Design a protein around this ligand. Structure first.
Ligand SMILES: CC(C)CCC[C@@H](C)[C@H]1CC[C@H]2[C@@H]3CC=C4C[C@@H](OC(=O)CCC(=O)O)CC[C@]4(C)[C@H]3CC[C@]12C
Ligand SMILES: CC(C)CCC[C@@H](C)[C@H]1CC[C@H]2[C@@H]3CC=C4C[C@@H](OC(=O)CCC(=O)O)CC[C@]4(C)[C@H]3CC[C@]12C
Ligand SMILES: CCCCCC(=O)OC[C@H](COP(=O)(O)O)OC(=O)CCCCC
Ligand SMILES: CCCCCC(=O)OC[C@H](COP(=O)(O)O)OC(=O)CCCCC
Lengths: 648, 509, 76
């Protein structure tokens, strides 16, 4: 049975408890009568703390009673950090007095405006900047440095401070969300904190835009420094909540259509009717880039249909590029009619890629995955062209293909051509950020690939582990006498686990039910080694098929549960930047052969209105909610107070 | 006597003793009392069989309290005085010992650990990758210059924990690389009597390094909370198979020099069993490169999820195994009179033609194991007779097994793994940072070479009591001004507005 | 270190703050006594807004007090 003693802590006398009880219960008579002991020493310091760690001024701030605070400041009680205690409770009547005059409850690296910005109260920061309180700039104790930077970034990222200062709130919200996103990764461990601050900066940048009540105002916001320059800068800073704002999407859709209007039949027939006439529109744009017909190609939806039709007819005459209607098997290609039709599409992709890589300066270019896919596609196309040039010279024997060598240039050219047009047919998947139905699903595709690419780091070393086991167990069994056909691609499954390469290949194909279990026998009577080979092959089949695959579907399941809160936002951001890719000036798909002082004035006026509206929508909403009925209670008490005292 | 009043009496006094306010006002070191009390409540979660939610919640609140005391440090000097208290990091080692994973996934503890761990690592992926592989290409240079001169010349690199982690990682993967190399046709023909290769003579001063390393960490752990780590079991089976491989190659090296062809050898010949045990050894040695995944930020929590959902795969492999033995009891009983082996140069079910599958119980178990992968090709159920009823019942109770295995138990397995992973992502990063913490603690002492193994307290107790007094005072403040507040915050203002007006009225008379 | 200035926004005088404090705290005596400056010009418009964007009628609606609303509508 523990007979323990209280830890050492300072204890209050009983003669100050009669003072503090009147402080907490809230007198003005008896508190002042106890405060008549200023000249007459009643052997006590009136600011000496209780066991709760409070001076009486902290209670009078804690109970919102302005007149006890006024009394104690009139009789010169020691404040210390009473200003920060008042600011943390966001009592305005205390702070308006305390501005007008060892232990801390706060980190000493806090200036009075920083925790004011942390509390996100408008008028407290508004009266502190009237006193001119400066915040430091975020350029020994790795604790105090980190929490100091975190405090001043969280203070600088409040909506009220960006409202009252920082002349363009859009730029400060954008750059500050960028810097917090950078420090999420650089500072390795407060990534929830920095991530949440960057997210609140993004929500603030959205909610400023949400307050526009005129489309003229919205145009003055987005077209500000050709056009849509602030929207281009918003795409640049990954402000995806800002650009999935609805009215921005109405302005973008009104830009995008330009008389598209219906129902599915009329829309389908008009889209395919435009798509059957894309070379007509492109060549009449080239012979006359004027207001005759080329206004169609200037419209973004119609040039999207034209690029889509040109890309899928490139795919159609790649589908056509292997039929038996069109060459026999000889060394020396002398390319087809179809290859001569292919070449002024591939060269158009070469020119298009060189242009968009030149005007992006390889930065945030290669950072797009589709530029990597274009790069490998066009590299394989150039290698195909070069290898067909090499095979066109020096080879005219017309010897039969079955008698050719391995690594002959024609065969490698045809293989690289197939590896090229699998990619060229595959990146028709990137037009799915235009349909309303197929968009978010391919966003989910592109995001759960980022966890499939973690299971393909676990699974590959599981693979190499079992390959190290199996080839070590079977490499003495090299049965190849006879054997016109070898390997594991054979009609009869030959010696599978002989080399490490065929071993890796075998264990890859065993997860599809294609390695048919007599690979584990050898022509011997070595039933122990055969049994251990079957046992450690079954172990691999278990770990692959019923463990790692099911962990893969569980990880993809909850990783998709994480995303549907921000699904439509990311989809509208993607279809936005796809739409921004069709507003300039690159019309043909494959047929490639003062003035600011007024605008700055109007922009400052619209920002003044938007900030005023947002301050209104913050005060009348977030202050309300419940404090809404509590303020009515305070009114019903105070009004009756003045009814009573004024009656006398 | 009253097993009710005894149980609720103990539960009440543990719940009373596990409050934060009582540990604040008493119990001179609150860290030790929170730690030992969380340990005792975790024990009584299992020993007392039924109030495991209650005892578990009390232990969790003790862990949160031990975290929130540490969260109040506002100086890195204070944090150092907390963690380095009784070589160094002794309280942190004791916290790892008591499974205080919320305590050690505190952020500022992780900053102090990372500042210990790097010692000038600083960038971006290209520079970090090239510098890591540049260090990793030079590990025997660094190790042998540590051995010839363990001083401030160059061995300060190996004293740094990140660089010795890179050196151990590079040595372990070059052990794996010259195990990958240990089967190529470039390097012996098939004879009884190995006389081991150049590669085996290179293997042996890695395996002996693992032997010495395992003996050291098993000796200084006293086999308790040693074998309780799963990786020590994996090291134990790995090194046991290696020693069996060495011993069997010694046995085969003597008494055998016939050079007779391998196809004419016996079954259970010592060379063949040695090579099989060597393969079963290096599957494990290549496989426990998976345990370096508590160092990457991306691969960490995923392999934590691996290691935790294995604990339910290991329940379906108790249900599924008796389903297996049930259908084996059915099928071998139905087919053991059909023992067709006349002719049959090749037998069994590993054969090119699927022979008599369900004859013995062993081949039956083997058949029903392989049938869940689509590898038992359905003509195993015929026999050379016209017994179409028994053939049909064999196919019927084989299809019943295929249904129960493939579309029932596998889907129950994915449903159980699904919600069992839904239970864990509230405490995912905490467990990952705890794991990478104890991996980092494994590289702070003193074992530098990876394979090349050939009063003074009264001041500190005074400062520790002062820091505890400040931390307890700060925590009592952060409890009073927060949890008492929240709504009672506006209610206390209402009480003020009523009572102050009361004294305004009565004092007016 | 950013030495910044508050954005341009209209600021309230101190002689109307003594009026608005009685409006928010909820008098009928002193609010009407401040509203005795209808004929006698006390150099202020009584409907001039605070930094919160409110006229005093909006506070009296915001604090549910019908008689201050009746008073302000009675004094136009
Ligand atoms: C033969 C089939 C099985 C495979 C061949 C694929 C094509 C038939 C599909 C692949 C992508 C599809 C495109 C995906 C997206 C769109 C966007 C769509 O535009 C809209 O729906 C926008 C409507 C809006 O403004 O909201 C026009 C059709 C189009 C080009 C689709 C046209 C038909 C395409 C080329
Ligand atoms: C050939 C491939 C398909 C399989 C071979 C596997 C290796 C290439 C992988 C397996 C584990 C990997 C290791 C997993 C974890 C790390 C931790 C990583 O350290 C960090 O990232 C720490 C960064 C930080 O301080 O936050 C250094 C690379 C390393 C050793 C990786 C190096 C590459 C390894 C050895
Ligand atoms: C994660 C656990 C991995 C389990 C690996 C495993 O079960 O191997 C199955 C082994 C491998 O099958 P065979 O080698 O063909 O017999 O099966 C048996 O030996 C008997 C049937 C026993 C069937 C269970
Ligand atoms: C948990 C329920 C288990 C059900 C087991 C089962 O369905 O056995 C299928 C049986 C087994 O297939 P066979 O024996 O090859 O005919 O199929 C039939 O007999 C007729 C087709 C009927 C197909 C349904």
């Amino acid at each position: 049975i523990p007979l323990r003693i209280v830890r050492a802590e300072s204890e209050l006398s009983t003669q100050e408890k009669s003072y503090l009880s009147a402080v907490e219960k809230g007198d003005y008579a008896s508190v002042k009568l106890a405060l008549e002991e200023a000249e007459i020493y009643f052997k006590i310091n009136i600011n000496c703390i209780d066991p709760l760690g409070r001076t009486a001024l902290l209670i009078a701030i804690e109970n919102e009673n302005l007149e006890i605070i006024e009394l104690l400041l009139s009789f010169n009680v020691y404040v210390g950090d009473a200003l920060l205690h008042a600011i943390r409770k966001e009592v305005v009547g205390a702070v308006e007095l305390l501005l007008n005059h060892q232990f801390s409850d706060f980190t000493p690296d806090i200036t009075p405006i920083i925790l004011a910005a942390h509390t996100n109260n408008y008028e407290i920061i508004k009266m502190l900047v009237q006193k001119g309180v400066s915040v430091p700039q975020p350029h020994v104790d790795s604790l105090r440095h980190s929490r100091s930077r975190l405090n001043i970034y969280k203070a600088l990222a409040s909506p009220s401070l960006i409202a009252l200062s920082s002349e363009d709130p859009f730029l400060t919200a954008f750059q500050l969300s960028w810097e917090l996103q950078e420090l999420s990764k650089v500072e390795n461990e407060f990534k929830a904190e920095y991530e949440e601050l960057s997210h609140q900066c993004k929500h603030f940048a959205k909610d400023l835009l949400d307050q526009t009540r005129s489309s003229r105002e919205l145009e003055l916001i987005l077209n500000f420094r050709n056009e849509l320059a602030r929207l281009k800068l918003a795409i640049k800073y990954r402000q995806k909540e800002f650009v999935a704002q609805p009215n921005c999407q109405q302005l973008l859709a009104s830009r995008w259509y330009d008389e598209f209007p219906r129902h599915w039949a009329g829309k389908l027939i008009t889209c395919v009717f435009i798509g059957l006439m894309f070379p007509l529109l492109s060549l009449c744009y080239l012979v006359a880039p004027k207001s005759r017909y080329g206004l169609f190609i200037r419209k973004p939806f119609i040039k999207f249909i034209c690029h889509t039709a040109s890309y899928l007819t490139f795919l159609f005459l790649l589908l056509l590029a292997s039929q038996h209607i069109v060459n026999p098997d000889r060394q020396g290609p002398k390319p087809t009619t179809v290859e001569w039709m292919i070449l002024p599409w591939v060269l158009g992709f070469i020119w298009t890629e060189i242009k968009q890589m030149w005007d992006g300066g390889f930065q945030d270019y290669i950072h797009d995955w589709w530029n990597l896919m274009d790069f490998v596609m066009n590299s394989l196309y150039l290698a195909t062209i070069s290898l067909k040039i090499v095979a066109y010279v020096k080879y005219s024997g017309c010897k039969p293909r079955d008698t050719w060598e391995m690594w002959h240039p024609t065969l490698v050219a045809e293989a690289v051509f197939a590896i090229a047009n699998i990619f060229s047919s595959l990146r028709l998947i990137s037009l799915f950020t235009a349909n309303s139905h197929l968009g978010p699903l391919q966003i989910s595709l592109g995001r759960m690939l980022l966890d499939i690419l973690k299971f393909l780091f676990i699974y590959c070393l599981v693979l190499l582990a079992f390959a190290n086991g199996l080839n070590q167990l079977y490499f003495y069994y090299e049965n190849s006498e006879g054997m016109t056909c070898k390997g594991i691609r054979c009609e009869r499954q030959n010696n599978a686990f002989s080399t490490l390469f065929e071993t890796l290949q075998s264990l890859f194909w065993s997860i599809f039910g294609l390695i048919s279990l007599y690979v584990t026998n050898v022509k011997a009577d070595h039933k122990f080694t055969e049994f251990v080979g079957a046992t450690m092959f079954g172990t691999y089949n278990v770990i692959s098929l019923v463990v790692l695959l099911n962990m893969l579907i569980a990880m993809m399941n909850n990783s998709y549960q994480h995303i549907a809160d921000h699904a439509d936002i990311e989809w509208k951001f993607a279809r936005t930047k796809l739409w921004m890719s069709y507003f300039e000036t690159l019309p043909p798909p494959f047929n490639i052969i003062a003035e600011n002082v007024r605008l700055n004035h109007q922009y400052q006026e619209v920002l003044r209105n938007l900030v005023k509206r947002y301050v209104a929508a913050m005060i009348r909403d977030a202050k309300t909610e419940t404090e809404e009925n509590f303020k009515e209670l305070k009114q019903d008490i105070s009004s009756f107070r003045y009814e009573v005292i004024g009656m006398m």
